């Protein structure tokens, strides 16, 4: 019926159907369109007190809770989707990953290199598509597949 990992859902506020991908946590109103050796992605990471390494270039000791980290991620997704902000601009300013200095770009990679939830979301995204919140042991990610 639908591309890998998509399902129909219904908006609780409007009643209109939408589509949800349980691998990327993406959601969209329109019926989704539709694997390569390698993909290229950028990401924006928000770490929290239970991250594997609760430290980043932004903060020596990262103290925010997982719930507070998810709220930050949600707010960034909102501004990226509204066009108020660019993904690259928010990644440079707020990503708790050293790749912030590269607008979040992680380069190209194959299966077997990245943490599994990140890898699965990256390979399920279409070119140009962006994920919802993706959880790994490092924290919470917004992933943009660029190639
Ligand atoms: C792609 N991936 C799982 C990833 C996780 C954490 C960081 C930050 N050190 C960078 C990349």
Coordinates of N, CA and C and ligand atoms in Angstrom, one line a residue:
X1 N 0.8 -1.2 0.0 CA 0.0 0.0 0.0 C 0.9 1.3 0.0
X2 N 1.7 1.4 1.0 CA 2.4 2.6 1.3 C 3.9 2.3 1.4
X3 N 4.8 3.4 1.2 CA 6.2 3.2 1.4 C 6.6 2.6 2.7
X4 N 7.9 2.1 2.8 CA 8.3 1.4 4.1 C 8.0 2.2 5.3
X5 N 7.2 1.7 6.2 CA 7.0 2.2 7.5 C 5.9 3.2 7.7
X6 N 5.0 3.4 6.7 CA 4.0 4.4 6.8 C 2.6 3.8 7.2
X7 N 1.8 4.6 7.9 CA 0.5 4.2 8.3 C -0.4 5.4 8.2
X8 N -1.7 5.1 8.0 CA -2.8 6.2 8.1 C -3.1 6.5 9.5
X9 N -3.4 7.7 9.8 CA -3.8 8.1 11.1 C -4.9 9.2 10.9
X10 N -5.5 9.7 12.0 CA -6.5 10.7 12.0 C -6.2 11.8 13.0
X11 N -6.2 13.0 12.6 CA -5.9 14.1 13.4 C -6.9 14.2 14.6
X12 N -6.4 14.3 15.8 CA -7.4 14.4 16.9 C -8.0 15.7 17.0
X13 N -7.4 16.8 16.5 CA -8.0 18.1 16.5 C -8.9 18.4 15.4
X14 N -8.5 17.9 14.2 CA -9.3 18.3 13.0 C -10.1 17.1 12.4
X15 N -9.7 15.9 12.7 CA -10.4 14.7 12.1 C -9.9 14.3 10.7
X16 N -9.0 15.1 10.2 CA -8.5 14.8 8.8 C -7.4 13.8 8.9
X17 N -7.4 12.9 7.8 CA -6.4 11.8 7.9 C -5.0 12.4 7.5
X18 N -4.0 11.8 8.1 CA -2.6 12.1 7.8 C -1.9 10.8 7.8
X19 N -0.6 11.0 7.6 CA 0.3 9.8 7.5 C 1.5 9.9 8.4
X20 N 1.8 8.8 9.1 CA 2.8 8.7 10.1 C 3.8 7.6 9.7
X21 N 5.1 7.9 9.8 CA 6.1 6.9 9.6 C 6.8 6.5 10.9
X22 N 6.7 5.2 11.3 CA 7.1 4.8 12.6 C 8.6 4.5 12.7
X23 N 9.3 4.6 11.6 CA 10.8 4.5 11.6 C 11.4 5.9 11.7
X24 N 10.9 6.9 11.0 CA 11.5 8.2 11.0 C 10.8 9.2 11.9
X25 N 9.6 8.8 12.5 CA 8.7 9.6 13.2 C 8.3 10.9 12.5
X26 N 8.3 10.8 11.1 CA 7.8 11.9 10.3 C 6.3 11.8 10.3
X27 N 5.6 13.0 10.1 CA 4.2 13.0 9.9 C 3.8 14.1 8.9
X28 N 2.9 13.8 8.0 CA 2.5 14.7 7.0 C 1.1 14.5 6.5
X29 N 0.5 15.5 5.9 CA -0.9 15.4 5.5 C -1.0 14.6 4.3
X30 N -0.1 14.7 3.3 CA -0.2 14.1 2.0 C 0.2 12.6 2.0
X31 N -0.4 11.9 1.1 CA -0.1 10.4 1.0 C 1.3 10.3 0.5
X32 N 2.2 9.5 1.2 CA 3.6 9.5 0.9 C 4.0 9.0 -0.4
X33 N 5.0 9.5 -1.0 CA 5.5 9.2 -2.3 C 6.2 7.8 -2.3
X34 N 5.8 6.9 -3.2 CA 6.4 5.6 -3.3 C 5.3 4.5 -3.1
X35 N 16.9 -0.1 -1.7 CA 17.6 1.0 -0.9 C 19.0 1.2 -1.3
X36 N 19.5 2.4 -1.3 CA 20.9 2.6 -1.8 C 22.0 2.2 -0.8
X37 N 23.2 2.0 -1.3 CA 24.3 1.6 -0.4 C 24.6 2.6 0.6
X38 N 24.4 3.9 0.3 CA 24.9 5.0 1.2 C 23.8 6.1 1.1
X39 N 23.8 6.8 2.2 CA 23.0 8.1 2.3 C 23.8 9.1 2.9
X40 N 23.5 10.4 2.7 CA 24.2 11.5 3.3 C 23.1 12.2 4.1
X41 N 23.4 12.5 5.4 CA 22.5 13.2 6.3 C 23.1 14.3 7.1
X42 N 22.3 15.3 7.5 CA 22.7 16.2 8.5 C 21.8 15.9 9.7
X43 N 22.2 16.4 10.9 CA 21.3 16.2 12.0 C 21.5 17.4 13.0
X44 N 20.5 17.5 13.9 CA 20.5 18.5 15.0 C 20.3 17.6 16.2
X45 N 21.2 17.6 17.1 CA 21.1 16.7 18.3 C 20.8 17.6 19.5
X46 N 19.9 17.2 20.4 CA 19.6 17.8 21.7 C 19.9 16.7 22.7
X47 N 20.9 16.9 23.5 CA 21.3 16.0 24.5 C 20.5 16.2 25.8
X48 N 20.5 15.2 26.7 CA 19.8 15.4 28.0 C 20.6 14.7 29.1
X49 N 20.1 14.8 30.3 CA 20.9 14.3 31.4 C 21.1 12.8 31.4
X50 N 20.4 12.0 30.6 CA 20.6 10.6 30.4 C 21.3 10.2 29.1
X51 N 21.8 11.2 28.4 CA 22.7 10.9 27.2 C 23.9 10.2 27.7
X52 N 24.4 9.3 26.8 CA 25.6 8.5 27.0 C 26.8 9.5 27.5
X53 N 26.9 10.6 26.8 CA 27.9 11.6 27.2 C 27.2 13.0 27.4
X54 N 26.8 13.3 28.6 CA 26.0 14.5 28.9 C 26.9 15.8 28.9
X55 N 27.5 16.0 27.7 CA 28.4 17.1 27.5 C 28.4 17.5 26.0
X56 N 28.7 18.7 25.7 CA 28.8 19.1 24.3 C 29.6 20.4 24.2
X57 N 29.8 20.9 23.0 CA 30.5 22.1 22.8 C 29.7 23.3 23.4
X58 N 28.4 23.2 23.5 CA 27.5 24.2 24.0 C 27.5 24.3 25.6
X59 N 27.7 23.1 26.2 CA 27.5 23.0 27.6 C 28.4 21.9 28.2
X60 N 29.2 22.3 29.2 CA 30.1 21.4 29.8 C 29.4 20.3 30.5
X61 N 28.3 20.6 31.3 CA 27.4 19.7 31.9 C 26.0 19.9 31.5
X62 N 25.5 18.9 30.7 CA 24.1 19.0 30.2 C 23.2 18.5 31.2
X63 N 22.3 19.3 31.7 CA 21.4 19.0 32.8 C 19.9 18.8 32.5
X64 N 19.5 19.2 31.3 CA 18.1 19.2 30.9 C 17.6 17.7 30.9
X65 N 16.3 17.6 31.2 CA 15.7 16.3 31.2 C 15.4 15.8 29.8
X66 N 15.1 14.5 29.7 CA 14.7 14.0 28.4 C 13.4 14.7 27.9
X67 N 12.5 14.9 28.8 CA 11.3 15.6 28.4 C 11.6 17.0 27.9
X68 N 12.5 17.7 28.6 CA 12.8 19.1 28.2 C 13.6 19.1 26.8
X69 N 14.4 18.1 26.6 CA 15.1 17.9 25.3 C 14.1 17.7 24.2
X70 N 13.0 16.9 24.4 CA 12.1 16.6 23.4 C 11.3 17.9 23.1
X71 N 11.0 18.7 24.1 CA 10.3 20.0 23.8 C 11.1 20.9 22.9
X72 N 12.4 20.9 23.2 CA 13.3 21.7 22.3 C 13.3 21.2 20.9
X73 N 13.4 19.9 20.7 CA 13.3 19.3 19.4 C 12.0 19.6 18.7
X74 N 10.9 19.5 19.4 CA 9.6 19.8 18.8 C 9.5 21.2 18.4
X75 N 10.0 22.1 19.2 CA 10.0 23.5 18.8 C 10.9 23.8 17.6
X76 N 12.0 23.2 17.5 CA 12.8 23.4 16.3 C 12.1 22.8 15.0
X77 N 11.5 21.7 15.2 CA 10.8 21.1 14.0 C 9.7 22.1 13.6
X78 N 9.0 22.7 14.5 CA 7.9 23.6 14.2 C 8.4 24.8 13.4
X79 N 9.6 25.4 13.8 CA 10.1 26.5 13.1 C 10.7 26.1 11.7
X80 N 11.2 24.9 11.6 CA 11.7 24.5 10.3 C 10.6 24.3 9.4
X81 N 9.5 23.7 9.8 CA 8.3 23.4 9.0 C 7.6 24.7 8.6
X82 N 7.6 25.7 9.4 CA 6.9 26.9 9.1 C 7.7 27.8 8.2
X83 N 9.0 27.5 8.0 CA 9.9 28.4 7.3 C 10.5 29.5 8.1
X84 N 10.1 29.6 9.4 CA 10.6 30.7 10.2 C 12.1 30.6 10.3
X85 N 12.6 29.3 10.4 CA 14.0 29.0 10.5 C 14.5 27.9 9.5
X86 N 15.7 28.0 9.1 CA 16.3 26.9 8.3 C 16.9 25.8 9.2
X87 N 16.8 24.6 8.8 CA 17.4 23.5 9.5 C 18.9 23.8 9.8
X88 N 19.6 24.2 8.7 CA 21.0 24.4 8.8 C 21.4 25.5 9.9
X89 N 20.5 26.5 9.9 CA 20.8 27.6 10.9 C 20.6 27.1 12.3
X90 N 19.5 26.3 12.6 CA 19.3 25.8 13.9 C 20.3 24.8 14.3
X91 N 20.8 24.0 13.3 CA 21.8 23.0 13.7 C 23.1 23.7 14.1
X92 N 23.5 24.7 13.3 CA 24.7 25.5 13.7 C 24.6 26.1 15.1
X93 N 23.4 26.6 15.4 CA 23.3 27.3 16.7 C 23.1 26.4 17.9
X94 N 22.3 25.3 17.7 CA 21.8 24.6 18.9 C 22.1 23.1 18.9
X95 N 22.7 22.5 17.9 CA 23.0 21.1 18.0 C 24.2 20.8 19.0
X96 N 23.9 19.9 19.9 CA 24.9 19.4 20.9 C 25.9 18.4 20.3
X97 N 26.2 18.5 19.0 CA 27.1 17.7 18.3 C 28.1 18.6 17.6
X98 N 29.4 18.1 17.6 CA 30.5 18.9 17.0 C 30.2 19.2 15.5
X99 N 29.3 18.4 14.9 CA 28.9 18.7 13.5 C 28.1 20.0 13.3
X100 N 27.7 20.6 14.4 CA 27.1 21.9 14.4 C 27.9 22.9 13.5
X101 N 29.2 22.8 13.7 CA 30.2 23.6 12.9 C 30.1 23.4 11.4
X102 N 29.5 22.3 11.0 CA 29.3 22.0 9.6 C 27.8 22.0 9.2
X103 N 27.0 22.9 9.9 CA 25.5 22.9 9.6 C 24.9 21.6 9.8
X104 N 25.5 20.8 10.7 CA 24.9 19.5 11.1 C 25.3 18.3 10.1
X105 N 26.1 18.6 9.1 CA 26.4 17.6 8.1 C 27.3 16.5 8.7
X106 N 26.9 15.3 8.6 CA 27.6 14.1 9.0 C 28.3 13.4 7.9
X107 N 28.1 13.8 6.6 CA 28.7 13.1 5.5 C 27.9 11.9 5.1
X108 N 28.4 11.2 4.1 CA 27.8 10.0 3.6 C 28.2 8.8 4.5
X109 N 27.3 7.8 4.6 CA 27.6 6.6 5.3 C 26.8 5.4 4.8
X110 N 27.2 4.2 5.3 CA 26.6 2.9 4.9 C 25.9 2.4 6.2
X111 N 25.1 1.3 6.0 CA 24.6 0.6 7.1 C 25.7 0.0 7.9
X112 N 25.5 0.0 9.2 CA 26.5 -0.6 10.1 C 27.4 0.4 10.8
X113 N 27.4 1.7 10.5 CA 28.3 2.6 11.1 C 27.6 3.5 12.2
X114 N 26.3 3.8 12.0 CA 25.6 4.7 12.9 C 24.8 3.9 13.9
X115 N 24.4 4.6 15.0 CA 23.5 3.9 16.0 C 22.2 3.5 15.3
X116 N 21.7 2.4 15.7 CA 20.6 1.8 14.9 C 19.4 2.6 14.7
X117 N 18.8 3.3 15.7 CA 17.6 4.1 15.4 C 17.9 5.2 14.4
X118 N 19.1 5.8 14.5 CA 19.5 6.8 13.6 C 19.7 6.3 12.2
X119 N 20.4 5.1 12.1 CA 20.6 4.5 10.8 C 19.3 4.1 10.1
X120 N 18.3 3.5 10.9 CA 17.1 3.2 10.3 C 16.3 4.4 9.8
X121 N 16.3 5.5 10.5 CA 15.5 6.6 10.1 C 16.2 7.2 8.9
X122 N 17.6 7.3 8.9 CA 18.3 7.9 7.8 C 18.0 7.2 6.5
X123 N 17.9 5.8 6.5 CA 17.7 5.1 5.2 C 16.3 5.0 4.8
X124 N 15.3 5.3 5.7 CA 13.9 5.3 5.4 C 13.5 6.7 4.9
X125 N 14.2 7.7 5.2 CA 13.9 9.1 4.7 C 14.1 9.1 3.2
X126 N 13.3 9.9 2.5 CA 13.6 10.1 1.0 C 14.5 11.3 0.9
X127 N 15.1 11.4 -0.2 CA 16.1 12.5 -0.4 C 15.4 13.9 -0.2
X128 N 16.0 14.7 0.6 CA 15.4 16.0 1.0 C 14.4 15.9 2.1
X129 N 14.0 14.8 2.6 CA 13.0 14.6 3.7 C 13.7 14.7 5.0
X130 N 12.9 15.2 6.0 CA 13.4 15.4 7.4 C 12.6 14.5 8.3
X131 N 13.3 14.0 9.4 CA 12.7 13.1 10.3 C 11.9 13.9 11.4
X132 N 11.1 13.1 12.2 CA 10.6 13.6 13.4 C 11.7 13.4 14.5
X133 N 11.4 13.5 15.7 CA 12.3 13.2 16.8 C 12.7 11.7 16.7
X134 N 14.0 11.5 16.6 CA 14.6 10.2 16.6 C 15.5 10.0 17.9
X135 N 15.2 9.0 18.7 CA 15.9 8.7 19.9 C 17.0 7.8 19.8
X136 N 18.2 8.1 20.3 CA 19.3 7.2 20.4 C 19.9 7.4 21.8
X137 N 21.0 6.6 22.1 CA 21.7 6.7 23.3 C 22.4 8.1 23.4
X138 N 22.7 8.8 22.3 CA 23.3 10.1 22.5 C 22.3 11.2 22.8
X139 N 21.0 11.0 22.5 CA 20.0 12.0 22.8 C 18.9 11.9 21.8
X140 N 18.3 13.1 21.4 CA 17.2 13.2 20.5 C 17.7 13.9 19.2
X141 N 17.4 13.4 18.1 CA 17.9 13.9 16.8 C 16.7 14.4 15.9
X142 N 17.0 15.4 15.1 CA 16.3 15.7 13.9 C 17.2 15.4 12.7
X143 N 16.7 14.6 11.8 CA 17.6 14.1 10.7 C 17.1 14.6 9.4
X144 N 18.0 15.2 8.6 CA 17.8 15.7 7.3 C 18.6 14.9 6.3
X145 N 17.9 14.1 5.4 CA 18.6 13.3 4.4 C 18.9 14.2 3.2
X146 N 20.2 14.4 3.0 CA 20.6 15.4 1.9 C 21.0 14.7 0.6
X147 N 21.4 13.4 0.6 CA 21.7 12.6 -0.5 C 21.3 11.2 -0.3
Ligands
LIG1 C1 24.9 9.7 13.9 N1 24.9 9.5 15.3 C2 24.3 8.3 15.9 C3 25.5 10.4 16.1 C4 25.2 10.4 17.5 C5 25.8 11.4 18.3 C6 26.7 12.4 17.8 C7 27.3 13.4 18.7 N2 28.5 12.9 19.3 C8 26.9 12.3 16.5 C9 26.3 11.4 15.6

